[PDB]
Amino acid sequence: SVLVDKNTKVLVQGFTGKNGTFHSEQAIAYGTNIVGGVTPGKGGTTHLDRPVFNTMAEAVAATGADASVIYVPAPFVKDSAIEVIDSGVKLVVIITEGVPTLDMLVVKEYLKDKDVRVIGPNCPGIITPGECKIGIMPGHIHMKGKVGIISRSGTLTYEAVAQTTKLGFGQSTCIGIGGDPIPGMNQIEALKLLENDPQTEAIILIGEIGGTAEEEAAEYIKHNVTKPVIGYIAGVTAPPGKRMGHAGAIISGGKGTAEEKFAAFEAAGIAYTRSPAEIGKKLKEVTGWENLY
Amino acid sequence: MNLHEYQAKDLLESYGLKVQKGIVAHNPNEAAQAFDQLGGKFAVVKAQVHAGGRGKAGGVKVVKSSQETREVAESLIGKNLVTFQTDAEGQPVNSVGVFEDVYPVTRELYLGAVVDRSSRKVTFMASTEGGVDIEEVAHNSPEKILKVEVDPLVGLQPFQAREVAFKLGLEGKQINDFVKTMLGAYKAFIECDFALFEINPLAVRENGEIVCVDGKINLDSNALYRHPKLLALRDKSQENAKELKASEHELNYVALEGNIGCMVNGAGLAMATMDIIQLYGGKPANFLDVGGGATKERVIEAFKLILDDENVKAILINIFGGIVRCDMIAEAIIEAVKEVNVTVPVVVRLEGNNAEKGAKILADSGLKLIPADGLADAADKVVKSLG
């Protein structure tokens, strides 16, 4: 596994809010160590039988948290992200959708000399099945195993999880890097981590239209990733010049098409499927893994 | 969010750029009056629509009298304009702009900027090839596109704009005017949360002035909460009626040309579903992301969006319930179907949380819902329902 495990201590920014409350309840039930959270104006209260703090500095001093998840509305995300970056927390998961692109441009630049990883925004988070979940993904579809998953989508990731669970392979760590044009953690960062993780024996890379990240990741894999990678790209049928839900899912200047992504996997010797139903099956073919169950 | 030509010009003027100025007219008398107000031998009347290709489509006319202006406005206002960059219905023309004549000119440049996703930096592009589609230039002669990556800490510096001005072969006051143009555009870009802009052409007039003749600005819609004056520019008439309606019900909808409608939670999965439909011989009719916690009301609106297309002959609902129980989702789907005229076969794939209790509720609702096991099953069945 990478980044999170049973020892991870998690703070929640926007802890007292609707989604912070709901997903924190689930996280506690799952076995995630939620140590408290931050909501300005509710410092010194308790929530879900955990302390609430006004500031991340107070929270981190009190709890020695090493991760944080952000459920704050988009307007306050740049503020919240810098706050946690400055706090001593090493891992930040940003769930929130609608963060301005230029806010992540600045945050991503701010991170360049820091010792902090940021996953998201507009992502379901990170899960090490059997150990720790940070985000909104349903624990029950996952199983502790050997397939690492990197994905720009939410529910499409759950299909690959369902397929690898059913084939009995299970997941090491699944990283939802999110649907935005400038993520805090890109595919190459995540591939490096999984390549170095002994629990991960194979990797699924899920992408979609927009940007050139999959092509760049392809070139990186060719030279630097020894574990088998199985790719899949959503949006073959997407019309050009249209946002397909996610801010980053858009073809423009005839670039960011699904086909050029498949073709890049081709050229790099990376295995892939053209059907979302056959991700697990393609992985099975490539690995030769077998089990009568 | 896109801006009208006159709105983009007003914005850029406010950051000190020079523009081909005009007056907006909502009726032909107002257009005639604008012509006399400008007080020039010639003006250019331009349909205000969010689209390029306006001239080719008959939406740009040079005029020499108030009478000619009224005629042109009367011809344009209240009709939709179809251009090579619109869909087949075109964009409504509710107004024209009557613009001052700034020609003849010495030469035409291109200037624009994007947020480059690979470098993660605001990037400017400039060329000697103004009045050419810059995509063609990029493809055929990439060496003619000059690029400047901006460092977020320092911003665009005068020396970077001078490097460009010298490579463009500008001379004299043209250099300092071009530098001020690029610096002002950068300030606007950040201060307004632009996603991209293009000025094409950026004219070098006979007296050396650097003038924005036609310009487009696309704003980051997700930043408009902090720009009330920019949000106030929004022209909903230029947005697709169904896309707009979907947005009002926490749905994301895009129409295609096909015969199988789709309803999915999550954008990745919605595009994947469209893709597997086509793999299995079908033609996806739409993208539709119903989001998390789809209620009865929200599913009703999704049905109405899809079936408003007469070409739709079957629907696939594909929902992966994680935090929300599949039997509760099945309840909402059943309640929704009961309120809508659902005239086509509906295949339903419900997976995740209690997929089994959900599938049974569907099977016993007596609405002829076709239950599907996996993604492959769902595609296979919805295409087969076409006969």
Ligand SMILES: CC(C)(COP(=O)(O)OP(=O)(O)OC[C@H]1O[C@@H](n2cnc3c(N)ncnc32)[C@H](O)[C@@H]1OP(=O)(O)O)[C@@H](O)C(=O)NCCC(=O)NCCS
């Ligand atoms: C982030 C999001 C979940 C928040 O929605 P929410 O939980 O309904 O919002 P709420 O208003 O109830 O809660 C937000 C909380 O943030 C708190 N907050 C605001 N600024 C904050 C800050 N700087 N630090 C910490 N907390 C803060 C608010 O005070 C509020 O708590 P309160 O209600 O006790 O006051 C929502 O804006 C969003 O982005 N939804 C989509 C998420 C998504 O789909 N992501 C992709 C998944 S793949």
Ligand SMILES: [Mg+2]
């Ligand atoms: Mg989404």
